[PDB]
Structures are given as C-alpha cells and as structure tokens.
Amino acid sequence: LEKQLTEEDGVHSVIEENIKCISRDYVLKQIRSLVQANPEVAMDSIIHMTQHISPTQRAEVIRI
Amino acid sequence: VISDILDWKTSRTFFYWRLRRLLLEDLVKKKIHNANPELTDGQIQAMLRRWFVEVEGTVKAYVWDNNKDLAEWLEKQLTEEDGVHSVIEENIKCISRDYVLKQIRSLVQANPEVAMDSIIHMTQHISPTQRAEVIRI
Amino acid sequence: IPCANHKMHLYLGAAKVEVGTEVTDYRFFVRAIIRHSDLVTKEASFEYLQNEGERLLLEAMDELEVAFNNTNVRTDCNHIFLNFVPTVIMDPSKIEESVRSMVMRYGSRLWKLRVLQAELKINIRAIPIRLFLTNESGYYLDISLYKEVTDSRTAQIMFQAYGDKQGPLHGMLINTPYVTKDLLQSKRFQAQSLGTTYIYDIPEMFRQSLIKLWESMSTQAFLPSPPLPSDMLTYTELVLDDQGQLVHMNRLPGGNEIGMVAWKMTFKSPEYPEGRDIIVIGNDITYRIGSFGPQEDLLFLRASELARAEGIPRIYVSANSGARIGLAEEIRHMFHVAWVDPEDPYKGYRYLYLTPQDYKRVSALNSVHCEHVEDEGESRYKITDIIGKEEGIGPENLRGSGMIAGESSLAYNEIITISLVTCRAIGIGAYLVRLGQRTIQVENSHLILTGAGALNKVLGREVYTSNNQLGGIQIMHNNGVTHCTVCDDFEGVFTVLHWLSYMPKSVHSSVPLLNSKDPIDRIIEFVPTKTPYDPRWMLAGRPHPTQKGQWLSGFFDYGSFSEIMQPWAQTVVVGRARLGGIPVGVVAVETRTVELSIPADPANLDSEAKIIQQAGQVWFPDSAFKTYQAIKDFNREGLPLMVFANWRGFSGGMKDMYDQVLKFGAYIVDGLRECCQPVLVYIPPQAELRGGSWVVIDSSINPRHMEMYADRESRGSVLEPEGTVEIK
Amino acid sequence: IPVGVVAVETRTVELSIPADPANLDSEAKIIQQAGQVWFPDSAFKTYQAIKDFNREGLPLMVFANWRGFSGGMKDMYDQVLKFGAYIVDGLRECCQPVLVYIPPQAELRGGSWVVIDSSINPRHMEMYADRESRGSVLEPEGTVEIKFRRKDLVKTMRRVDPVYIHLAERLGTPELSTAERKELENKLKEREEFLIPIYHQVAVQFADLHDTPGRMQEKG
Ligand SMILES: *C(=O)CCCC[C@@H]1SC[C@@H]2NC(=O)N[C@@H]21
Ligand SMILES: *C(=O)CCCC[C@@H]1SC[C@@H]2NC(=O)N[C@@H]21
C-alpha cells in the first residue's frame, strides 16, 4: 500500500488509475441523472459542453 | 442586543403570531435551501424579502414587521395549490432549475473527458426540433 | 368449602388431568341463590337491583377472601355466579349500566382476588337474560348480554345475542362446560404474578388509552367527532423470517418463539386524526425469564432500522433480566477431576478431563476442546476450552448486546425514542432505556446494573435488601434519569400517547397545531411579582386565590402544561406546553429557595444525609445539566423553545466549582448552537440577566434561530448595581 | 506512531473530597475506589479522552480491564448510567482506528464489554485478547450462584467422591437394618457437607472454562 501511495512519476500507482476510473464514472452518472430527472435543462447545457471539444468530436455531435 | 421591548399582559398574542411567522418562514426557507443548497442565510432571507415586495408592491413593503399580516400571506403561498398556484413556488422552481444547470456545467467544465459520454443520452428524450438545433449548431 | 351465610355456595375446583401431567389449574367458584318475591316495577326496581347487586357482590368477595387465604393452591380464574329467583321488569340496558358501575367501583378488590369471570341470571317481566362479564387487566371491563332461546330442532337450548356485538357465546349451548386454561393463560398469569402486564395485552391498552386521550383533550381544543374504537388502532406484528428480515404478519397472540415482540401500529389521535405510525418493541418477561438472546437482539435491531427508515417514533417496553447466560450442561455431567491426591481431595486438583467414552460423543459437535494426555496410567482428554453446543448462551450475546446499544445511540439522533419500564431492567436493558433518554418508570420497578444480592456477596455483608434501593424511583427520578412516574402500565401507555400529542408524526413533518379553546387574544391575568413565586403560576395559571372558582390565566394554553423531571434540580423548571395550540418546549426559572436532600449510602456507615439550600435565579451544576438535557431533547423532538430567563449568574462557590459547574455551563452553549427550531428567549417582568447567564444564551450563538425579548420591568447587564458601585 | 492511550488502574485509590468553607456543617471525606471498576468520574474522564482524541485526530489504544460498573446506591445516584451511555456515543463517532486489547490477567465482564464492543463502530474498532485474558457476562462466582447451586454440586459429588459413592451404594441395599441405615445417612450427610468448599472451587473452575478466549475466537 505504501508503494502505491508514496511513489509518483515512476510506477505511477495503478491503484490511482482505478480510483480515477471510479471518479470519472461517478461524475458521468451525476450528469446523466440530472438531465434525465430534469429534461427541461438539457438544451441549456448542451451548448457549453460542445465548445471545448476537438473538431472531430463536434463532427460526431453534428452527425448523430 | 434585544429585538424589542414587550408588555407582559399582551405577550401571549405577540409570541403566538411571531412563532407562527417564524415556522412558516422556516418552511419556505427549507424549500429555497433545497433548490440551491449552496446559498447562505442572508441570501435566502433577501430572496424572501424581495419576492414579498415584488409581488405585493412597494407601497405594501412596510407590511413586513407585522407578524399577523405576513404570516397570513406566507400561509396563502404555502397551503393553496391548483388555484392561485403560489408564485413563490414558481420562483423556487426557477432557483432549482438554474442550480442543477450550474452543476451540469460545472462537472463538464471541470472534467471535459466525460463531455462526449453524456452528450448522447441528453439528446435522446428531446423534441425533433431540439435535435435539429443540436445538429445545426 | 363451608362458609357463613350458606346461600353463597363456594367450591374449589381442580382441572381434570391425565396420569401424566400434574394439576396446575385451580379455581374458586361462587354459586349463590338469591330468593325474593317477584317485583312490580313502577320505575321502582332500580334501588332493588343496585342494592342487591352491591350487597351480593360484597358478600361474594368477602367469603371468597376468607377461603382464598385459607389455602395455597394459587388459583387464577375465579368465577362468581349470581342466580336471582325473582323476575324484574327493567330494560336490559339499564341492568347493564347498573352492573357496570358496581363492578367498576369495586374492580380493584376483584382484581386482587383474581375474579376474572362473572355471570348473572335474571328474568325480565318472562324472558331470561344472562349477563356475562370478563374482567382481565384492570383498565377494561367487558360486558356481554345474551338471551336463552329454545327455538331449536332438539331439546337443546342456545344463546342468542342482540345482533350488536353478538360475542363468543352466540349460538353456543347454554350447558357449555367451563374450560381449563388456554394458550394465553398460564403465560399471562405468570406475567401478572410478577407485577407486570403480559406483552400481548399491550395493543389493547393503547386503544383504550387513546379513548381517554380523545376525552382528555376535549377541554383544550375543538376536536372532530372521534371514530369508533374499532377504527382508532390497527396493528401488524413484526416477526423474523429464516434470513433475519422483517415480515408483516397477522396471527393470533401468544405465538412468539422468542422473548421479543414488536408491532407496527397505526392510530388516529386528536392532533393527527388521519393516522400516525409508531413502532412498539417489548420484552416477554415469561420467555426464559427476561434474557436478551441473539434472536431477540436481531429483532430489536431490525425494528429499530424500520423506524429510522420511515422516520417514525420507537417505543420500547422494558421488562427483562439483561444479557442471557448459561452453562454447557452436556459437559457438566461428564467431566472428572484429576486430583493431586485422589484419596485426600483437599490438596488441590490439577485439571478437569473427559474419558474417551465421553469425548467420543462430543468431539463431533465442537462443544469442547480437549487435548489427549496420559496420566495415572489412564487415557484422558484434558479440557482446555468449553464452547457449548447450545447457541445463545455464549459470548455472542455480548456482541449482540453492544450491537443494539449502538442502534439506540443512532436512533435517538434521527427519530423519537420513548421507553417505558414496567417490570425491571438489568444491565443492557437499562442502557437501552437510557440511550432513549425519555424514560417512564412504573411504581415498584427498578433500573439496575448489579443486583443487591451480588453486591452483598461482593461486599461480604447484607448491605442491601431490595433492588429498589439501587434503581427505584427514589433514585432514578431524583437524579434525572426518569422523566415521569406512573402508577401502572396503563397509565404509562397513556403518558406515552400524551407526550406524542405534542410532537410531529414523523421526522419529515411539521409540528401539530390544534384549534385551541383558549383564545390567543386574551391577556395574562397573573403578573410575576418582585417576591418569590412559583414559576408554574405564570406558565399555566393558578386558582383565583380570592374566590373559590375563577382561574387566573397564564402565558400558555390552559391545561396544556406538562412538567418533566420535576424533583431533579428544582431550581429550574422544564416541560412541554401549547401556545395558541402550538406545541413548544418550556424552560423557566425558580425564584424560591429549595431544599436538596441527599441520601446516605448504606454501604458506607460513616456517611450522612445532607440538606443543601439552593437559591433561585442561580445556575448550579445539576440545574445547568438539566437545562442542557432539555434543550438537546427538544431539539431532537422537533419543537421550538420558549425560555423565560431569570438567572443572576452561575454559582462560584468552592463546592459547585469542584462539582464541575463550568463544564455544564459550556454544554449549554454547545446545545444551543445545534438548534434547528425557533428559540425565543423572553425576560419576564421583575427578572434580570447578569453576566455569565447572558453570554450562554445570547442570540449570537445561533443567530438564524435565536431571538431575545425583554419586558419593561426587566434588567440586564454584566454586573448587578452593587457590584458596579463597588468598583466604579 | 502517535496514539491515544486508555488504561485501567487495578490498585485501590483514595478519593479525597474537600469541605466547603461556606457550609460550616460540611466535612471532608475519603472514599476508597477499587480498580477495574467504572465510576461516574472515571467513566466521564474516559468519555472526555475519547472525544478529545477523536477531534485531535489520533488512533486509540485501549487496554481494557474493567470488571463492570459500580451499581451501589451512591454511584447510581451520581449518574453512573448516564456517563456509561456517553461512552457509547463517543465511540460511535470515531473516525480513526480504535484497537482494544485485553492484557494478560485482565477481564471484561458484562456492562463493561457492551459499551466498547466493536459492533458500535465496526469500520474502525477491533478487539484482541491475550491468552491470559477472560471475557464474559458474569464472573464465575456469579454464574455458579445461578446455574450450579448446592443441589447440583451434590449431584456431581454423587459420581466422583469414592467415599460418598461407597456410602451411597451401601445405603441402596434393601433392608440392611434400621441402625445401619441411620449410621449410613449420618455418614453421607457429614461427607457431603465436608466436601462442599472443594467442589465449589471445582464449580467455579468449570465456569471459568466457559470464559476463555478460545470460545470468543470460535464465536467471532
Ligand atoms: C446567592 O446569592 C448566590 C449563591 C452563590 C453560591 C453560594 S456561594 C457559597 C455557597 N457555596 C456554593 O457552592 N454555593 C453557595
Ligand atoms: C468491588 O468489588 C465492587 C465495588 C462496587 C461499588 C461499591 S458497592 C457499595 C459501595 N457503594 C457504591 O456506590 N460503591 C461501592
């Protein structure tokens, strides 16, 4: 455990990667939960989250 | 250091109407807090004061340090539905809507890496015109 | 049994049993004959019925008293039968009223004599009627009435009731014999023989208590018409499945396989006439005497979990003996002692062991841990640890006990918790009461951690005689543990319901408001004076001292004030009340001097009892701690506070400083900082706040909820005038 | 590694209570306090320590050697029960590791266990025992006084003591003589009475075998 907690830029602490996976999925679930529980705001945030994206990502937004 | 100076003989009436006011205010303040848990106490109280004046009018703004009158007004906003429809509830709903919107924006902006994983699901249960706007922009 | 006035023929009857099971059911039967000429009624037979009823009932009780004390068979269900020869013209309902009143007024004596059934035969006008009375637990009397009807196909006669409340004997033959007790009896009897109510009689008490409640509150508020008793309370029993989860089950009473029973109860009260829910948990005193086992602990836990999940009150009825213990009897009759000298056993033994013949029969059970040894030329299995094949007697009961203790600590901070002590609580039981912090204690019941006998064994002499010396009312009610004392179980149930009428139905509900019959727009007729006065006079009011009638009104609604923890720390008054139908918690200050009596410990022959004078308008360690308890309890209950603050400061003497006045003064601040309900402090007339007593209730502690108001005859500063002139 | 420490005194101590000079009828007192007991003062001190170390942010190492709470009139009057409850409420709010260890020649009995049991705060609390430790609801004496009274002790002697066995078997012979039966009965009475203290020690030893840490380990 000490090796996973004290060493950085190196072994890189695989456990930290798993924790980051959890954090990512949790915030994603919160986003989905808020929009699905309250569709009336879905189109007020849809713009801002499609601004700081790569042009290919914008192409996927337009295409679908 | 004290709020007021009272007479003993009439304290029963005063404290009755005051407690009634405070309890009703607690109800509406709890609703406000749940709409936006990140507000503080001054903000909540200011919202209530402004809404009272805005709805009743500025001439009636003096009717605030009157426990009976303001308790009756609050009760009417809290107890009646499908009818007057309780304009205060509409303002509370506005707060709630904007708060959840801010949470959405905050999460995506603090973490762009998830932006394209939720972008699909929130463009499903929408009207076709809304989808047209999504495609167009 | 012969007796004087042998118109009252007494018999002692013993149930017929087989050659196996012995006799345990013994009952007295009084069979009387009343001879008199027929009556012609001109509304002139009422006195006859009343006088003969009273006279015969008293004579029956007297003869039975004599014969009851002359023998020792321990009867349970004594019966009285009065056959009246004369015919009377009377409406049967009037006879019902007469018998009802006569039985109720002498119900205590009938209870002491264990008279549970009674029958009265009397002819109307002539048609016979037969009155059948059941008088169990002394709160409710059941009267039924039947006519004998001969309209049958055979020569047999049967009872026919009046349609309304047909009852058990409807369509039954008039020659039905008397039975030999039932499921509930012989367990109900034991429980009553210990001075406590049987567990499965608790729901009924609630119903009857609610009736009293709807009557009692009729003088305080404008209430709707009460529903019929059959719609006032409905309940379902909570049982455990094979997995440990709760099942809502409807079954007959007395079917519990463990010592714990629980119910979910829904009932209509004056403040909530649509239905409010509670969870009731109780110990069965007759199941393996008291004794929390693992399953009892589990049921307690799961029911408490339910209460927290729904956010509703939890009521705990304590009648137990603490944690369950036991001994491994399968080893007790097998072990042998390895003596140091087998011929002289008084030079010690080395170990205890099993022989192979015994070890081979237990090794497959994991009931004992032994090691093989060779000693004295014999094969032996020396015992090192005993486990026990029986579950529920080992250290698993420690864990379980601790488990539920934690649950109670959590429950107090989420829901309402009320505890009623009906028989006794030992050890963990007491803690379970304490962790609810709202205790009702029946007279002649005790909360202890160690029994008197154990203490006498430890100390070496007969120090203590009764467990009531250790945990009875005279200790628990005066040190702040018990809030209220009641005379019996029924009054206790009533008190529980009474307290519940002030508070929300759930943690997610507002405070219940009533339409009070005391106007809000009146004035207060009692004025606090400069001289000492009872603080109750301003809270509730007093009888008008000039006249014989005429009540001088106080601050709060008439009749709504209920004090708690009355004899503890008598310099401060705390309670519940209603202001215009709004329930509030109440704190007030005594201005009279009071006398604190401290008893002498009988275990220390060099100790002495002491009387200490406590002045009013002062915070002492006890009164400060009481105030903290009240504040914390009302914050959890969900009520606003109305404080009538009249403290001149804290006691600074050596003995109160040694007894930690400063600590409790700090606790007051920490209590007020966590209020979530409105807190209104009012300085009455001829009242003052000085120095330390202000800074602990100042509105700056909790600015969102706290407010302070003063009368025109009030004072407030750091120092009194004398203390100021002595400096400046 | 810094830790908070709780431990128990086993020696007897003297509590000296001063006299208030404002009450000329008061007296100073000396009260003997036994060890391995929880009194109101020591219970409250323990609560204070637990709460203070929880806020300070340190784990707790508890060397638990309490035989139970004081049940006497004076400690019950001085609110021992309340402070015993406070201990539970303190442990339920721990956020740091809490390690309870029963030292050798130490015991936990009854009320003193159920207030520090790991079930209060399962995430943080742990309990460990030495081999010379004991733990149960009741001490051996209190157990034998309930479950192993004199009648059962005699029943045990019936199958152990050779002298009592020989006499009991001899008296079982039909129609020996009146005088011989009387003599045998008196011999049995004297032998069974004479052997009570030794079989009493045996009984409490038997009960002690139920309070070992092996049982606690098997039960979890
Ligand atoms: C009354 O005017 C103030 C009483 C203050 C407390 C007094 S002073 C001396 C006594 N000792 C003590 O602990 N309390 C008493
Ligand atoms: C020691 O073996 C156990 C001591 C239990 C407390 C004793 S019993 C009688 C005394 N009164 C009291 O309050 N504590 C003392």
Side-chain angles (χ1 to χ4, degrees):
Chain A
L1 291 169
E2 182 176 332
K3 289 181 182 176
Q4 293 295 308
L5 295 174
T6 57
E7 296 182 359
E8 296 182 353
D9 300 338
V11 299
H12 302 295
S13 297
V14 65
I15 299 299
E16 292 291 351
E17 293 176 352
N18 290 335
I19 295 166
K20 286 176 183 180
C21 287
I22 291 170
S23 176
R24 187 176 179 279
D25 290 344
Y26 175 76
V27 298
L28 180 61
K29 287 181 183 181
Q30 289 179 309
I31 295 164
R32 289 175 180 175
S33 178
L34 291 172
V35 296
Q36 292 308 150
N38 295 101
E40 66 278 17
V41 294
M43 295 295 99
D44 293 316
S45 65
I46 195 78
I47 303 302
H48 293 77
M49 66 181 71
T50 59
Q51 287 179 334
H52 297 141
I53 60 167
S54 294
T56 60
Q57 295 178 305
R58 184 177 179 184
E60 290 295 296
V61 172
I62 293 167
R63 183 181 66 76
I64 300 165
Chain B
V1 302
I2 59 172
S3 294
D4 203 356
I5 303 170
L6 305 175
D7 293 316
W8 170 243
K9 290 183 179 178
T10 63
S11 62
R12 179 175 168 80
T13 302
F14 175 82
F15 280 110
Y16 173 80
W17 287 111
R18 184 64 182 169
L19 182 59
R20 178 65 181 170
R21 174 178 178 179
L22 291 169
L23 295 168
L24 296 170
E25 286 179 3
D26 286 345
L27 296 170
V28 70
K29 284 176 180 180
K30 284 181 186 179
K31 286 181 182 174
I32 295 168
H33 178 73
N34 286 344
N36 188 337
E38 298 181 354
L39 301 170
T40 190
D41 292 317
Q43 292 176 307
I44 294 165
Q45 184 66 78
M47 285 180 184
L48 289 168
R49 182 66 181 272
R50 287 197 301 273
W51 294 346
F52 176 77
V53 176
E54 286 176 359
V55 174
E56 294 296 307
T58 57
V59 72
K60 296 181 176 181
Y62 68 93
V63 185
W64 181 262
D65 293 318
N66 184 307
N67 292 328
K68 183 175 183 297
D69 297 341
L70 184 61
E72 291 178 358
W73 184 84
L74 292 166
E75 182 177 339
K76 288 180 183 175
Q77 293 296 304
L78 296 174
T79 59
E80 296 181 357
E81 298 180 356
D82 297 342
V84 298
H85 301 293
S86 299
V87 65
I88 300 301
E89 293 289 355
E90 291 178 355
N91 289 337
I92 294 168
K93 287 175 181 182
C94 286
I95 291 171
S96 179
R97 187 178 179 277
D98 292 341
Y99 175 75
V100 298
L101 177 61
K102 288 182 181 181
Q103 290 179 312
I104 295 165
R105 290 175 179 172
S106 177
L107 290 173
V108 296
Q109 291 308 151
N111 295 100
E113 65 275 18
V114 293
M116 294 297 98
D117 295 319
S118 65
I119 195 78
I120 303 302
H121 293 79
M122 66 180 74
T123 61
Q124 288 179 333
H125 298 142
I126 58 168
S127 293
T129 61
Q130 292 177 308
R131 186 176 178 183
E133 291 293 301
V134 170
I135 294 166
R136 184 182 65 75
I137 300 166
Chain C
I1 297 167
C3 55
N5 46 278
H6 65 280
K7 67 185 183 181
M8 310 297 287
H9 303 263
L10 180 64
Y11 296 81
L12 177 63
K16 294 183 180 177
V17 301
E18 294 84 3
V19 301
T21 306
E22 70 282 352
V23 179
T24 61
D25 186 12
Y26 297 92
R27 290 144 74 148
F28 289 98
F29 297 78
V30 178
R31 297 176 184 283
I33 304 168
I34 303 96
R35 292 186 174 84
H36 192 279
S37 62
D38 290 321
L39 275 73
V40 182
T41 301
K42 302 295 183 181
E43 305 291 297
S45 304
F46 290 94
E47 290 80 0
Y48 174 81
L49 295 168
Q50 291 177 5
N51 290 335
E52 292 296 324
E54 184 176 23
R55 184 182 299 106
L56 271 292
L57 182 62
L58 294 169
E59 290 177 0
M61 287 195 291
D62 293 341
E63 297 296 344
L64 183 62
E65 181 176 299
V66 174
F68 183 78
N69 293 335
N70 287 335
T71 189
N72 296 278
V73 303
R74 300 292 186 270
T75 61
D76 188 16
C77 179
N78 295 334
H79 191 291
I80 296 172
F81 179 50
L82 307 178
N83 190 336
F84 292 76
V85 172
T87 304
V88 181
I89 300 162
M90 187 60 67
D91 188 298
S93 69
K94 297 295 185 183
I95 295 169
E96 178 179 333
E97 288 176 355
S98 180
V99 177
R100 184 183 294 279
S101 182
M102 292 297 173
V103 171
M104 288 300 295
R105 67 180 73 185
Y106 297 121
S108 63
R109 294 182 64 185
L110 292 171
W111 178 245
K112 289 179 179 180
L113 299 171
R114 305 297 302 167
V115 184
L116 304 177
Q117 297 179 329
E119 292 184 2
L120 188 148
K121 181 173 180 179
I122 187 169
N123 296 334
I124 304 303
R125 266 176 204 287
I127 297 170
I129 60 166
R130 313 257 298 235
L131 282 67
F132 295 86
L133 289 84
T134 303
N135 186 7
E136 297 177 355
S137 299
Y139 60 91
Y140 177 73
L141 175 65
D142 192 79
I143 302 172
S144 299
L145 179 66
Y146 300 78
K147 302 187 285 182
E148 292 176 355
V149 181
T150 63
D151 186 16
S152 62
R153 301 289 77 77
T154 68
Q156 295 182 304
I157 299 174
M158 65 186 74
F159 287 122
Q160 298 289 338
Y162 292 71
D164 188 355
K165 190 175 174 181
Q166 291 178 359
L169 309 170
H170 188 73
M172 187 177 286
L173 298 172
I174 65 168
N175 294 272
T176 302
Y178 291 98
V179 301
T180 61
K181 307 162 176 180
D182 59 68
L183 180 62
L184 299 173
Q185 300 183 59
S186 304
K187 292 183 182 178
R188 190 172 67 192
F189 174 55
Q190 297 178 355
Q192 292 176 5
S193 296
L194 301 175
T196 183
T197 305
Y198 184 58
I199 191 169
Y200 283 104
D201 294 342
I202 288 161
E204 296 298 325
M205 287 194 281
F206 274 96
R207 185 173 295 104
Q208 294 299 312
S209 298
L210 287 168
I211 292 166
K212 184 172 176 181
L213 186 64
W214 278 84
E215 292 175 350
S216 179
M217 291 178 71
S218 68
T219 65
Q220 294 183 1
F222 295 101
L223 302 173
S225 294
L228 295 172
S230 65
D231 299 316
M232 290 174 77
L233 192 145
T234 183
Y235 65 91
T236 307
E237 187 176 356
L238 302 176
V239 300
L240 296 171
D241 62 0
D242 57 310
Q243 301 297 306
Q245 302 296 309
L246 293 176
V247 182
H248 296 264
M249 186 177 288
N250 295 305
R251 63 181 180 175
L252 296 171
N256 57 311
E257 296 179 353
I258 59 174
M260 186 67 73
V261 183
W263 300 278
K264 185 172 175 184
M265 295 187 179
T266 302
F267 64 93
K268 296 182 175 66
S269 63
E271 68 280 350
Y272 290 113
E274 298 178 1
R276 63 184 298 174
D277 293 341
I278 58 170
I279 307 300
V280 181
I281 300 164
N283 294 118
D284 182 6
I285 193 73
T286 65
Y287 181 83
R288 305 179 67 82
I289 301 295
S291 80
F292 298 91
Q295 295 293 312
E296 291 82 355
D297 290 339
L298 181 62
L299 175 58
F300 181 99
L301 175 64
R302 297 295 185 192
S304 177
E305 286 184 355
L306 176 62
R308 291 192 292 100
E310 292 180 1
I312 60 169
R314 179 175 67 81
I315 312 300
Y316 175 55
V317 182
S318 181
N320 64 66
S321 64
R324 188 176 293 169
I325 58 99
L327 182 140
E329 291 181 351
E330 64 276 17
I331 304 302
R332 179 179 68 181
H333 294 298
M334 296 181 177
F335 72 95
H336 300 258
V337 184
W339 298 98
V340 174
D341 188 320
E343 299 292 325
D344 184 3
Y346 292 80
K347 297 182 175 63
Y349 60 94
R350 294 194 293 278
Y351 57 91
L352 307 179
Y353 65 96
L354 301 174
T355 63
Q357 293 81 13
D358 293 319
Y359 178 80
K360 289 180 179 183
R361 295 184 292 165
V362 297
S363 68
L365 303 174
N366 200 35
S367 66
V368 64
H369 295 172
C370 301
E371 61 183 356
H372 183 283
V373 301
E374 182 177 359
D375 193 359
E376 301 185 77
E378 299 182 349
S379 164
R380 294 178 179 173
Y381 291 92
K382 182 170 72 176
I383 299 165
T384 63
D385 303 77
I386 299 167
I387 308 303
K389 68 181 184 181
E390 184 179 0
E391 297 292 347
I393 57 166
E396 62 273 18
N397 290 337
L398 291 171
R399 163 166 290 295
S401 291
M403 181 180 72
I404 61 171
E407 183 63 20
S408 294
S409 289
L410 179 59
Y412 180 74
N413 290 330
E414 296 191 359
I415 57 169
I416 306 298
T417 60
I418 302 168
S419 300
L420 177 65
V421 186
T422 60
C423 183
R424 66 181 183 273
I426 301 169
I428 182 65
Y431 290 121
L432 292 170
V433 173
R434 180 83 283 273
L435 294 168
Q437 302 184 35
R438 300 188 187 80
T439 302
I440 302 166
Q441 190 173 354
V442 177
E443 286 182 3
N444 198 33
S445 69
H446 55 271
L447 304 176
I448 58 170
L449 304 175
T450 305
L455 292 175
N456 287 337
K457 186 172 175 66
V458 170
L459 295 171
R461 63 176 183 87
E462 294 83 351
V463 180
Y464 298 101
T465 305
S466 174
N467 288 338
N468 285 340
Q469 291 175 304
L470 304 177
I473 286 168
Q474 65 273 29
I475 305 301
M476 288 289 108
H477 191 42
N478 290 316
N479 66 359
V481 179
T482 299
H483 291 196
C484 181
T485 60
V486 297
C487 290
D488 61 2
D489 293 342
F490 183 76
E491 186 176 1
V493 175
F494 178 73
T495 301
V496 173
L497 295 167
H498 181 68
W499 285 354
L500 292 173
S501 69
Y502 292 78
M503 64 185 75
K505 67 184 184 176
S506 68
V507 79
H508 299 289
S509 298
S510 66
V511 178
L513 276 71
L514 303 178
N515 185 4
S516 174
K517 295 186 171 176
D518 194 346
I520 63 174
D521 61 356
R522 61 170 178 78
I523 61 166
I524 302 166
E525 299 176 318
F526 178 80
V527 181
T529 186
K530 189 178 182 174
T531 64
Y533 64 96
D534 194 317
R536 277 47 93 68
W537 295 341
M538 69 185 187
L539 294 174
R542 60 181 293 174
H544 189 54
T546 302
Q547 302 182 32
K548 303 298 184 180
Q550 298 300 310
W551 187 277
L552 295 176
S553 65
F555 183 87
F556 290 116
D557 292 4
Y558 177 79
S560 66
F561 179 74
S562 178
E563 186 175 3
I564 60 171
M565 291 188 286
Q566 184 270 321
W568 177 50
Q570 295 177 31
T571 56
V572 63
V573 180
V574 300
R576 294 180 181 86
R578 293 191 179 83
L579 179 64
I582 301 165
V584 302
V586 176
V587 181
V589 183
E590 177 67 75
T591 62
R592 296 174 294 177
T593 305
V594 300
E595 296 181 330
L596 176 65
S597 179
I598 298 167
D601 186 355
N604 186 331
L605 298 170
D606 299 313
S607 64
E608 299 180 355
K610 297 294 182 183
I611 298 172
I612 298 170
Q613 297 296 337
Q614 294 183 308
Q617 305 177 269
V618 183
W619 253 321
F620 297 93
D622 56 2
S623 64
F625 187 21
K626 180 172 176 184
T627 303
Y628 173 69
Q629 181 66 46
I631 292 167
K632 186 175 177 181
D633 190 83
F634 290 132
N635 292 338
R636 293 290 186 276
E637 184 172 331
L639 300 180
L641 301 173
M642 182 67 199
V643 184
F644 298 89
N646 189 5
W647 293 282
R648 291 186 296 101
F650 290 75
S651 172
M654 180 183 290
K655 197 51 174 35
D656 291 341
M657 291 298 286
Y658 183 81
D659 294 332
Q660 299 186 147
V661 66
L662 184 63
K663 279 147 88 143
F664 297 117
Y667 285 179
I668 291 163
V669 173
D670 289 351
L672 290 171
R673 184 178 66 82
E674 297 181 353
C675 299
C676 297
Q677 302 294 311
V679 183
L680 308 175
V681 182
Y682 179 66
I683 302 168
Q686 299 293 309
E688 58 182 358
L689 298 177
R690 303 287 178 186
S693 63
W694 187 294
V695 301
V696 297
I697 56 168
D698 185 80
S699 67
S700 64
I701 296 164
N702 190 335
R704 189 173 67 194
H705 294 289
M706 291 177 73
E707 300 182 0
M708 296 184 76
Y709 298 92
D711 199 348
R712 292 178 186 287
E713 299 183 49
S714 66
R715 294 289 187 274
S717 190
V718 180
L719 300 173
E720 67 286 351
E722 294 177 351
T724 307
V725 299
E726 290 290 327
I727 296 170
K728 298 295 183 186
Chain D
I1 302 168
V3 303
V5 178
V6 182
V8 184
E9 176 68 74
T10 62
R11 298 171 294 178
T12 303
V13 300
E14 298 181 330
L15 177 65
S16 174
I17 297 168
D20 188 357
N23 186 337
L24 298 171
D25 299 318
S26 65
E27 300 181 355
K29 297 295 183 185
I30 298 172
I31 301 170
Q32 299 293 339
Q33 294 183 309
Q36 304 177 274
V37 180
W38 252 321
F39 299 90
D41 57 3
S42 62
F44 188 20
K45 179 175 175 182
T46 301
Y47 172 71
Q48 183 64 52
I50 291 167
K51 188 172 177 182
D52 187 75
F53 289 125
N54 291 339
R55 293 290 185 279
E56 184 174 325
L58 300 179
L60 299 175
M61 184 66 199
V62 186
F63 296 92
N65 192 4
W66 292 283
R67 289 185 298 101
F69 289 75
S70 170
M73 183 184 287
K74 198 53 174 35
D75 293 341
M76 291 296 288
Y77 183 79
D78 294 336
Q79 299 183 148
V80 68
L81 184 61
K82 280 151 86 144
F83 296 119
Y86 286 1
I87 292 164
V88 170
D89 290 349
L91 290 172
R92 186 176 63 80
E93 297 179 354
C94 296
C95 299
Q96 302 293 309
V98 183
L99 309 177
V100 183
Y101 178 68
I102 300 168
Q105 301 291 309
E107 59 179 0
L108 296 179
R109 303 290 180 179
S112 66
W113 188 293
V114 303
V115 296
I116 57 168
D117 188 78
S118 59
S119 69
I120 296 166
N121 192 336
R123 188 172 69 194
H124 293 295
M125 293 176 75
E126 302 182 357
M127 299 184 72
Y128 298 91
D130 200 346
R131 294 178 184 281
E132 300 181 48
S133 64
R134 293 290 188 275
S136 191
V137 180
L138 302 173
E139 67 285 353
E141 291 179 351
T143 303
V144 301
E145 290 292 325
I146 295 167
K147 297 294 182 186
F148 219 11
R149 298 181 178 175
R150 183 177 180 278
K151 61 184 182 62
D152 296 295
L153 190 145
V154 175
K155 286 186 180 175
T156 300
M157 288 194 293
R158 180 65 186 84
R159 67 179 181 82
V160 179
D161 184 77
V163 176
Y164 186 83
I165 292 161
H166 181 73
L167 292 168
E169 292 296 326
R170 182 59 181 174
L171 186 60
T173 304
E175 294 292 353
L176 291 172
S177 68
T178 302
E180 185 175 359
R181 285 191 298 273
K182 289 180 179 176
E183 291 177 356
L184 291 168
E185 286 177 356
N186 287 334
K187 289 179 178 178
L188 287 167
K189 289 175 182 181
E190 286 181 353
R191 185 63 177 170
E192 75 188 359
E193 185 64 21
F194 179 54
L195 293 171
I196 281 168
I198 206 326
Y199 282 76
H200 180 73
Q201 292 178 34
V202 170
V204 303
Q205 168 57 30
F206 181 89
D208 183 66
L209 292 171
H210 291 56
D211 300 347
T212 64
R215 193 178 187 187
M216 293 196 286
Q217 189 69 51
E218 290 290 302
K219 298 295 187 184

